Amino acid sequence: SYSGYS
Amino acid sequence: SYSGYS
Amino acid sequence: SYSGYS
Amino acid sequence: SYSGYS
Amino acid sequence: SYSGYS
Amino acid sequence: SYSGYS
Amino acid sequence: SYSGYS
Amino acid sequence: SYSGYS
Amino acid sequence: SYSGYS
Amino acid sequence: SYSGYS
């Protein structure tokens, strides 16, 4: 998964 | 999954 | 799933 | 699912 | 604002 | 703001 | 702001 | 801000 | 996974 | 700011 800001 | 801002 | 802002 | 703003 | 799952 | 999963 | 998973 | 997993 | 800012 | 995993 990805968590945060892209 | 993705959580946050893209 | 996706949660947040895209 | 998607939850939020797109 | 809030966007996503709580 | 908050974006994502809490 | 917060982005991601908490 | 915070970005990621907590 | 990725957590943070990209 | 904080970016990553805590």
B partners (3+ CB pairs within 8 A) are: A, C, F, G
Angstrom distance (rounded) from CA D6 to CA H1: 21
Which bin fits C4, alpha (ψ -120 to 50), beta or left (φ > 0)?
Answer: left
DSSP bridge pairs for G1: none
Smallest Cα distance from F4 to chain B, Å: 4
Q: How was this structure determined?
A: X-ray
Angstrom distance (rounded) from CA H6 to CA I5: 14
